Amino acid sequence: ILLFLIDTSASMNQRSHLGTTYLDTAKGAVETFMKLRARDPASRGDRYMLVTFEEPPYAIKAGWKENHATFMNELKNLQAEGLTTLGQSLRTAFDLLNLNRLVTGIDNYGQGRNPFFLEPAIIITITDGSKLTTTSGVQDELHLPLNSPLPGSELTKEPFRWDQRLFALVLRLPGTMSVESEQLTGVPLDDSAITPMCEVTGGRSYSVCSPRMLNQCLESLVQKVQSGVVINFEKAGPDPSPVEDGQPDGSQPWHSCHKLIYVRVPIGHWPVPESFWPDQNSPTLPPRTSHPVVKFSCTDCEPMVIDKLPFDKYELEPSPLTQFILERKSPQTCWQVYVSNSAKYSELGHPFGYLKASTALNCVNLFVMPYNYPVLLPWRQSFESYLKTMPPYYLGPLKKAVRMMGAPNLIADSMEYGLSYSVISYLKKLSQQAKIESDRVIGSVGKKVVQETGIKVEYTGFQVALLNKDLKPQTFRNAYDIPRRNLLDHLTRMRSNLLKSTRRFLKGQDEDQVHSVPIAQMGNYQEYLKQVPS
Amino acid sequence: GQTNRRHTAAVPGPGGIWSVFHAGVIGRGLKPPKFVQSRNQQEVIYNTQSLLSLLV
């Protein structure tokens, strides 16, 4: 799923050095991105959406239940007229991407946080350089407005989601020559108000300066689409305890890269449950975070973990692997990882996995382990006392693995909270109704706005008409659509047309055809008694 | 240097029973002005001489 955000604002009317405006260059770049992505044999399941800088009823051009034909037709007729309302457009796009999330089961907020339930989405937000306006002045903060929150959105406290990356294109093409071609293989950043918003999600922001640089950035962007598993790392709290082959001193601490969870839907178990201590009676649930604040500690702690535990291959995208490569990729050794923010009743973090590398030393495998592996792996009334340290709802998925061996547990203590189940079906129904109402009025514009609003300065109610583009005057049916110049000739033409008594008469003077004239479409409505047997 | 009376007296395609032969006009055709700059050759360079003398 790819949602292209093209502003089509009035500031996108300035002409480049090639002769076309920035909007035409953006549309051409989108078309070349389409034809480049079509090369990879994986573009048979994705869906394209379009978002412009227009009113909430008119911002979306093609959303759910819209094929490629209507999407291309809407992107073709894009007009650059309006202000640069970036915040409202980003909010509308994020709400559109989060319409079918509370109904299928993604981010249920009650049963862990399953990383194998993915809904990838990439935003391009092709906008102008700077100087965004909000009908009052020029702002320099880019704060997303919060006026009408969706039902069930206060449990994340952030507009974007687990898998929602945000790339940006500014299209800073000069007007005279664009002769800046010193650095060949180098794509700098835009350094604008959208740069922090993009970096928070996990995607960079390109700075287009030349058509060659545009082609380079488009060819570099097609290689950044996969399953979205974005997790945040922190150096705390080990004081860079990497004393293995050298001495530490770094910027590879707050790594917020993605992870490629390739399927073999995705197959996996043992998710990151949450970051708080869930109580048995809690009417209000604390809001989750889109990026989990999980921290790693550099300790050997028996990296050899061999068992019949179901295996996972959530591949990690190499972005800050320099710190690992400095220590020879940690051969035959790993380092634990633990989620912060009160992972248990009374403690600060519980190691639930590690980041052991592969034998090929190519990337990090991201070995996800159970909540507390070094205890259950090595019954004398031990498991009954051990199952009290883990979160309650967490007994859900692990028991499935126990199904591979037997079934000692039951549904006696399989209860998260009596108040968490309530006020959940109503929120899901409200979200479904909102998604249906949004998908219903998605393409039907029905503007019907043509007036001059004649002010005084039949009274207080007059309004002069405006020039209608698609008027289609009926010359043979309506007599008012016949001007004075070609009146007598048109009169004789109408007379001859009425006195001819032909078959299948029409009221159009000369209606040649539409913009498209297909050969197969016209040849299908015919009959040819021939087969060419010879 | 640099309406309908005439259209009615010759209408009905000379048949009074069919439509016109053509199918309309595109714009106007046969631009009336078609004027060319032919004011004068002499006494034009002397105005330029006077202007250059003023500028000098």
UniProtKB/Swiss-Prot annotation, chain A:
Source domain of life is Eukaryota
Q: What induces it?
A: Frequently down-regulated in nonsmall cell lung carcinomas and prostate cancers. Down-regulation in prostate cancer is due to CpG hypermethylation of its promoter. However, some involvement in cancer is unclear.
Does the entry annotate any disulfide bonds, and if so which pairs? none
Domain VWFA stretches: 1-225
Which Gene Ontology cellular component terms are annotated? actin cytoskeleton; chromatin; INTAC complex; integrator complex; nucleoplasm; nucleus
One MF term from GO for this chain? protein-macromolecule adaptor activity
Tissue localization of expression is:
Widely expressed. Expressed in heart, brain, placenta, lung, liver, skeletal muscle, kidney and pancreas.
Where does this protein reside within or beyond the cell?
Answer: Nucleus; Chromosome
Per UniProt, the keywords (alphabetical) are: Chromosome, Nucleus, Phosphoprotein
**GO biological process assignments:** protein localization to chromatin; regulation of transcription elongation by RNA polymerase II; RNA polymerase II transcription initiation surveillance; snRNA 3'-end processing; snRNA processing
Q: Identify its protein family.
A: Belongs to the Integrator subunit 6 family.
Spell out the subunit comment. Answer: Component of the Integrator complex, composed of core subunits INTS1, INTS2, INTS3, INTS4, INTS5, INTS6, INTS7, INTS8, INTS9/RC74, INTS10, INTS11/CPSF3L, INTS12, INTS13, INTS14 and INTS15. The core complex associates with protein phosphatase 2A subunits PPP2CA and PPP2R1A, to form the Integrator-PP2A (INTAC) complex.
Query: What task does this protein carry out?
Result: Component of the integrator complex, a multiprotein complex that terminates RNA polymerase II (Pol II) transcription in the promoter-proximal region of genes.
Q: Give the protein's recorded name.
A: Integrator complex subunit 6
Identify the taxonomic lineage of the organism of origin.
Eukaryota, Metazoa, Chordata, Craniata, Vertebrata
Encoded by which gene? INTS6
From Swiss-Prot, chain B:
Record's signal peptide: none
Q: Where in the cell is it found?
A: Nucleus; Cytoplasm; Nucleus membrane
* Self-association state and partner proteins as the record states: Component of the Integrator complex, composed of core subunits INTS1, INTS2, INTS3, INTS4, INTS5, INTS6, INTS7, INTS8, INTS9/RC74, INTS10, INTS11/CPSF3L, INTS12, INTS13, INTS14 and INTS15. The core complex associates with protein phosphatase 2A subunits PPP2CA and PPP2R1A, to form the Integrator-PP2A (INTAC) complex.
Question: What does the record give as the function of this protein?
Answer: Component of the integrator complex, a multiprotein complex that terminates RNA polymerase II (Pol II) transcription in the promoter-proximal region of genes.
Q: Which family does it belong to?
A: Belongs to the Integrator subunit 5 family.
Q: What is this protein called?
A: Integrator complex subunit 5
Q: What organism is recorded for this protein?
A: Homo sapiens
Species classification: Eukaryota, Metazoa, Chordata, Craniata, Vertebrata
